[PDB]
Amino acid sequence: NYHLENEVARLKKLVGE
């Protein structure tokens, strides 16, 4: 997962709602 896992939430919050 890595922060990438947190990144997915970070990126899916600004794009892909």
Tab-separated table of N, CA, C and O in Angstrom:
chain	number	residue	atom	x	y	z
A	1	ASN	N	0.852	-1.225	0.000
A	1	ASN	CA	0.000	0.000	0.000
A	1	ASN	C	0.871	1.252	0.000
A	1	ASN	O	0.762	2.065	-0.898
A	2	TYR	N	1.737	1.418	0.986
A	2	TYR	CA	2.623	2.631	1.015
A	2	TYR	C	1.752	3.906	1.086
A	2	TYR	O	0.529	3.860	0.936
A	3	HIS	N	2.340	5.055	1.307
A	3	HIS	CA	1.509	6.284	1.334
A	3	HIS	C	0.644	6.283	0.086
A	3	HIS	O	-0.423	6.822	0.087
A	4	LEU	N	1.100	5.627	-0.959
A	4	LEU	CA	0.297	5.503	-2.207
A	4	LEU	C	-1.136	5.175	-1.814
A	4	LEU	O	-2.090	5.703	-2.338
A	5	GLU	N	-1.248	4.304	-0.847
A	5	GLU	CA	-2.563	3.896	-0.303
A	5	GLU	C	-3.267	5.143	0.227
A	5	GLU	O	-4.425	5.399	-0.067
A	6	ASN	N	-2.541	5.956	0.943
A	6	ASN	CA	-3.133	7.239	1.435
A	6	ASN	C	-3.276	8.191	0.235
A	6	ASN	O	-4.207	8.964	0.144
A	7	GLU	N	-2.353	8.096	-0.695
A	7	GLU	CA	-2.375	8.929	-1.932
A	7	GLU	C	-3.648	8.637	-2.713
A	7	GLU	O	-4.320	9.532	-3.169
A	8	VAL	N	-3.986	7.381	-2.852
A	8	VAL	CA	-5.235	7.015	-3.585
A	8	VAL	C	-6.405	7.776	-2.964
A	8	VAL	O	-7.214	8.350	-3.659
A	9	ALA	N	-6.470	7.817	-1.656
A	9	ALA	CA	-7.566	8.591	-0.992
A	9	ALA	C	-7.361	10.088	-1.274
A	9	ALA	O	-8.295	10.810	-1.568
A	10	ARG	N	-6.129	10.540	-1.207
A	10	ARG	CA	-5.808	11.979	-1.485
A	10	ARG	C	-6.180	12.343	-2.924
A	10	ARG	O	-6.754	13.381	-3.192
A	11	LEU	N	-5.818	11.492	-3.844
A	11	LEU	CA	-6.089	11.749	-5.285
A	11	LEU	C	-7.557	11.463	-5.629
A	11	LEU	O	-8.160	12.174	-6.406
A	12	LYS	N	-8.143	10.446	-5.046
A	12	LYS	CA	-9.582	10.142	-5.338
A	12	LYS	C	-10.506	11.177	-4.666
A	12	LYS	O	-11.700	11.186	-4.897
A	13	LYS	N	-9.962	12.055	-3.852
A	13	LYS	CA	-10.807	13.094	-3.183
A	13	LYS	C	-10.899	14.333	-4.076
A	13	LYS	O	-11.921	14.993	-4.133
A	14	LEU	N	-9.840	14.642	-4.782
A	14	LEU	CA	-9.852	15.826	-5.688
A	14	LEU	C	-10.361	15.402	-7.076
A	14	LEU	O	-11.027	16.159	-7.756
A	15	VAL	N	-10.060	14.192	-7.490
A	15	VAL	CA	-10.532	13.713	-8.825
A	15	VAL	C	-11.127	12.306	-8.700
A	15	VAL	O	-10.564	11.438	-8.060
A	16	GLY	N	-12.265	12.078	-9.308
A	16	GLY	CA	-12.906	10.733	-9.229
A	16	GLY	C	-13.789	10.662	-7.979
A	16	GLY	O	-13.555	9.865	-7.090
A	17	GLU	N	-14.801	11.491	-7.907
A	17	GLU	CA	-15.705	11.480	-6.717
A	17	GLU	C	-16.961	10.649	-7.014
A	17	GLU	O	-17.245	9.750	-6.240
